[PDB]
Each structure stands twice: as C-alpha cells, then as structure tokens.
Structure 1
Amino acid sequence: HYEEGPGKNIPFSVENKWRLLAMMTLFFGSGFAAPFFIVRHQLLKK
C-alpha cells in the first residue's frame, strides 16, 4: 500500500528542504516565466 502521514501524501519530496526549494522554484518559476517567453517568442517572429 502507500505511505501515509505528513510529507508522504504528496507527489513531491519534502525530505530535504533545499532540494524542495529547488523544485518549488522550478515549478512556480516555470509558470511565471512562461508568458514572458511566449511574448518574446511572438516578438521575435514578426
């Protein structure tokens, strides 16, 4: 069966807070960056 309890009912690891910081940073930061890069992509076509 599955792991249960705090920090185990989630699809990401919270075992190491620094690795977690990196993941959260990539995850939220990719979301926030995407429109800027899409704008840039549109700008650079015509």
Structure 2
Amino acid sequence: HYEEGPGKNIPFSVENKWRLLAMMTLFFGSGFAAPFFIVRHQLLKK
C-alpha cells in the first residue's frame, strides 16, 4: 500500500521546503520559459 496524509498524496516531496522551492522553480520556470526559447528558435532559423 501507499503513504497517506498531508504531503504524502503527491508525486513530489515537501520534506524540505528549499528542495521543494528548487522543484517548483524548475517546474513552473520551464513552462514559462519554453515559449520564449521557441520564439528564439524560430528567429534563429531564418
């Protein structure tokens, strides 16, 4: 069986709030950054 309770019903860990901040930063940051880099990609092709 699986772990249950606050902080245990999720695919990411919230054991360390700083490691968590790193996770969330990469997660949400990669999403927000993607369009900018795709725009850069399109501009650097021609």
Q: Alignment length, in residue pairs?
A: 46
Match of 2:16 in 1: 16
What is the SS of the residue equivalent to 2:30?
A: helix
Report % sequence identity: 100
Gaps of 5+ in 1: none
Q: TM-score, normalised by structure 2?
A: 1.00
Distance in 1 separating the partners of 2:18 and 2:41: 32
Q: TM-score, normalised by structure 1?
A: 1.00
Q: CA RMSD in A?
A: 0.1
Give the drift of 1:8: 0.1
Give the drift of 1:3: 0.1
Q: Which runs of 4+ in 1 moved over 2 A?
A: none
